[model samples]
Target: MRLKELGEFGLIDLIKKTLESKVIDDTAPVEKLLLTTDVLNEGVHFLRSYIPEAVGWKAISVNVSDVIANGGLPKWALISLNLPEDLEVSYVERFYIGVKRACEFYKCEVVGGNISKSEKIGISVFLVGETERFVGRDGARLGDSVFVSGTLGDSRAGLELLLMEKEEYEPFELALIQRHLRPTARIDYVKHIQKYANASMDISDGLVADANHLAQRSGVKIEILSEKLPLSNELKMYCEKYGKNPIEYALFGGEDYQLLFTHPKERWNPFLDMTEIGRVEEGEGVFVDGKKVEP
Candidate 1:
C-alpha cells in the first residue's frame, strides 16, 4: 500500500511495531535517556519573510519542548543543514547565532552536526536529553486534571498576520508576530513541574489533537473546557478584528509548542502557574465541552 493510504502516523506505528518486535529489547533504560529530532523546510516550515534568527531559534525550541515534556533536561544537540549554494555567508552565521542563543537558553550544547548543499534550505536537529524521573504519554489515569503551560492561539494569530501582510499595526500585533517567530520551549519550568505531572506531551499539533495522542496512549478520555481555554489578549484582539474564532485556532492550529500534561487533583496546587483546561476521564478520544473533537 502507498504511504498516503497508510497516513503519516500509521506509517510510524507500522515501523514502531516492526522495530519493537525485532530490534528493541527490554534492557533499554527508562528515565536515563531521551532523544528526538525534527525537520524544517523552506516552503513548508517557514517562509523567506521569516528572519533567519527566528527560524533557527524555532528549530531548536521545538525539539527542546519535546525533551521538557518528557521530564528531561536538554543536554546536547546535533544539527544538520541543507543550504543553497548561493546563500549568503552572513545569513548562515546569523542562523547559527539564533541556534546558539537557543542552546544557551536551554543550557544545551551543539556538540556536532552535518552540512550539505541543496536546492532548498532545510534543517534537521537531533537532540539528546536526560531525566532522573521520566514522564510518558501512557501514565495518565481517570480523574487526572489536565493542565497546559501558557496561552494558545497567539502563534496562529501571528502566522496569519505574517501571511496576510498588514500595513497598519495594532498595539498588540507585534507581540503576536514575535510569538510566531520565537516561541518559548518551557524548559525552565520542566524540572519544577516534573514531579506533579503523570502524563505529558508537547502541544505541537494543537491542543485537541495532541491531547488525543496522550489520551490514546493512556487509554483515557480528555474533556476540555472550551470556554476555559487560555487565550492571550493579543489573540483575542486579533480574532476580534479579523472576525475569526480564537477557540478554533486554539483547538486546530498546529505548532504552538506548549506543554500539555495531566496531573492528579491532590497534586494540582503546585501547578497553579499552569492553566487548567481539561481533565482525564474513563473512555477513549478527546472532547471539548462534551463535544468530541477530531484529531
Candidate 2:
C-alpha cells in the first residue's frame, strides 16, 4: 500500500506504532507539564505571497493552540528556522517581530532553537506549558453537552478568498480573508474551559472529523446539530453570494483552530465566546443532525 492510501492520520499511526509511542493524553493527571510541536513549510503551509509577519504569527499560534487545547498555559517555546540562502534579512527581522508579538501576547518566552539553511523556508515551533488540571479528548461522557468557541467556516471561507486573490470583494469577504491569514488561538479561555469542560480539543481538522476523534477516545457518540453551528454573518453573506453551503464549511472545513469541548449537561457555565452545538450519548461514533458518521 502507498502512503496516500493510508492518509495523513494513518501515516501518523504507523509512525507511532513503529516508534512504540502514542499520542499523549492531557486529561489524565499524570503530570503538570505540557509539550507540543508544529512545523510550517513554505509553499505548503503558507504561500510565498502571504505576509511574512502573519506566517510567523501562525507558526507560533498553531503550536500554542495545542497547549491551550490541553488546558495548559503556554509559557515557553523553541523555534527552529530553515531559511533559503537568498532570503532577505529584513524579511527575517519582520518575521521575528511577529513572533515576538505572539510570544508577548501569550506570555510565552522564546528560550532557544537552531537556525539552518535549506532549499525552502520553514518553521518548527516547540511549546512548553503548565497546568494544574488538563482536559483531553477522553473525558467526555454520555449526556455531556457539546460546545464550540466562536464561529466556524470563516477561516475556510477566508482561505478560499485568499487563494483566489480576488481583487474585488465585499467587506465581509475581506474580513474572512484576514481571518485566514491571521487566526488567534483561544489561549485566554484555557483556564475557564479547563474548569468546566470534560473533554476538549482544538479544531485543526474539520469539526466533524475532530469530534469523531474525541468521541472515539471517550467511547461515546457525539451528535452535532447542523442548525446550531455558529456561523459568522460574514461567512453567511459570503456563502449566500457564492451559492455555497455554510453548514458544509462549518462541518468539514479545516484550520479554524477554535476550541471544541463537552461539559455536563446539568452543569452550566457561562463562558464567553462559546455556544452549545450538540450532545454526547451512548454510542461508539459521531453523528451530524442524527445521521451516523462512518470511518
Candidate 3:
C-alpha cells in the first residue's frame, strides 16, 4: 500500500514486521533511568490554531506516556523546536508556559534543548525517566484481562470535530477539544500499573496497533470486546452529530494516550476506573469483537 494508505505507524510496521518494531523502543534503560523521544509535526500532530501552548503540553505529555507505559516515572525532558522564521516570539512564550505547567504537574524537569529553523513548525522532545520497577510488552499471560485506563477515542473525535466549521464551541464541543489538545499523561496510574500489570503499553497509534505489539511481544492473542470499550459521552455526541461510528473511533482512533495493560483476571480489583475491554488468550493477533484487525 501507498504511504498515505499505510500511515505513519503502518510505514513503521512495514519496517518492523515486514522487514522484522513499538512503543518504537518504548524505552532504553540506563540503570534505573529509562529514555524515549517523540515528535509533533506541523500538520500531522496539530492544526487547531497552532495553539502553541497545546503543542508545548503535547510534546511533553506524549513522551511522558512512553515512560509511564512501562510503569516508570518521568523526571526530565529536552525540547527542540523547528520554527518558521516569521513565527511570533509570543508563540514561544505561551508554549513555554504550557511546558512549565506540564513539568510542574508531572514533577518533571526540562534541562536542555536546541532550536532550528524550518518551513513547517515541529517540536521534538527527548525524555528520561526513573523506574524502581518496570513492566514491558513481553509479560502478558493467557487469560489476563486487557485493561485500559480512561475512555477511548475522545482524542481523535476531538481532532475531527476541530476541523468542522461551527458557529461557536459548545460545552461538549470544548470538552472533546480539550481531550485532543491537552492530553494528560497518566503519571498517577504508573504506581497501579507497577503493582498489578503483567504487560503494559500506552495507547498512541490506536488500540489495534498498540494491542498488536503487546500480543506479538507477549506471544498471545488479545480479544478486545467492542461493547466493553469505554466511550465518553462527548465522544458519542461527536459521533452522533457527525454520522460516524463511535466503536470505530474507539478501536481505531489515535492519540488517546491511555494505558493498555494485561492483568491477571483473578486478581482483578477494577480500581481507579480501569476498564476491562478484552482478555489475552492462547492465540495470535488482535481480534476486536472477534474479528481480526491490522495497523
Candidate 4:
C-alpha cells in the first residue's frame, strides 16, 4: 500500500486497529504512552551514500532513546517501512534483522506495522512503553547530582573520523564509528537507574544543550566538572590534533545517546561507581567546573 492511498492520518488509523491487545503494562506505577514514526529520506537524516543497515539501526534507536528519556521502559514498537525499488530484498531483511536484534537487546516487542514502496527508503518506528510513577524534564531539584552514563563525545568523535578518516587510530576508533552508526540507547540502565534519578533525558543534543534544557525546565543551575568526563583516547587524540577543546565536544556534541540525568545528592553514591559529571544547584545556567557554559 502506498502512502498516498493511506494518507498520513489514515495510515495511523489503519495501524490503530491491530493495536487492541496492547502488551504495555499500564498497571505499573506509570500510565499510557503514544507514539508516531516517520521514515526520513536520504539527506533528510543521513548522507546519500549512508549504509542501509546503519540507517535502520539509527532510525529505531532514536525513537527508543526518546521513550527512555520520557521515563518509560519500551515494551513494544510498531514498525512502518517504505522501501525504494532499487534496494535488494537481502538488504531489507538485514534491516529487519537489525530491528529484531535491537528489540531483543532492549526487551521490546515488534507489535505491528506496514511496508510499502516510496520514492525513497524510510523507516518509521512507533515505540510504546510504560513506567512506574514518572520522571520528566521538570522533575529536578536544587542540589542534585547530574550524571551521565558511559563516556561522552565518543560517537561524535567517531563521526569526525568517518568524514575525515584521519589515519593511525586504534581498533576502538572503528568501534566508536560503529557506535555512531548504531548507537545504543541507555534503556537497560534507566530501567535500573530511574528510581534514583531526579530528572533525566538522553544526550541527543549533547551535554550542554540538554543540560541547559533540563535546568531551564526545572529552574536549577547545573555545574559540571571538565576533568570527570569519561573520554576515549580517540576523542582525546582528535581534540589535540585539531587543537580544539575536548570539553566543548564532550559538552555540546550531540547523538551520544548516553543518559544525562540528575538525582538527589544523598542517593548519588550508589551510582558513584557510575559517572557523575555534574551537579544541580539553585540558580540559572549550566557551568563546567564553576564557570558558566558560554555555549
TM-scores vs. true structure, each candidate: 0.91, 0.94, 0.90, 0.80
What is candidate 4's lDDT per residue for 1-295, written digit by digit as tens?
A: 7989777558656566668532220222324563534355665566545566776677678777767765677787888877778878887777777787787778887879898988777767777776664566778887788778778888887777777745555676777787788888777666545577778777877888888878888888888899998776777776787677877788878868787777876665454346878778877888888878754
Q: Can you rank all candidates by TM-score, best first? A: 2, 1, 3, 4
Estimate the overall C-alpha local distance difference test score of candidate 4: 0.73
Model 3: colliding residue pairs: 16-20, 17-20
Per-residue lDDT over 186-295 for candidate 2, one digit per residue giving the tens place of the 0 to 100 score:
99778777788889899988898899889898889888889999999999998998889999999987879899988886655565778889999988888888888643
The local lDDT score (0 to 100) that residue 82 gets in candidate 2 is: 96
Q: Give me the runs in candidate 2 sitting further than 4 Å from their true place.
A: 24-31, 266-268
Instruction: List all candidate RMSDs to the true structure.
Output: 2.8, 2.0, 3.0, 7.3
Supply the global lDDT for candidate 2. Answer: 0.85
Once superposed on the true structure, which residue ranges of model 4 sit more than 4 Å away at CA?
1-31, 34-40, 47-51, 165-170, 241-243, 269-273
Cα miss at 241, model 4 (Å)? 4.3
lDDT of 1 by residue, 112-205 (tens): 9989999999999888888877787878988899988889888888888888877767779989988878988888667755687888888888
lDDT for every model?
0.83, 0.85, 0.85, 0.73
Write the residue-wise lDDT of candidate 3 on 99-216 in tens digits: 9999999999899998899998888899998888778888899879989989999998787777775657888878888888898988878888878899999998898988998899
Which one is best on TM-score?
Answer: 2
Rank ordering of all candidates by lDDT, starting from the highest: 3, 2, 1, 4
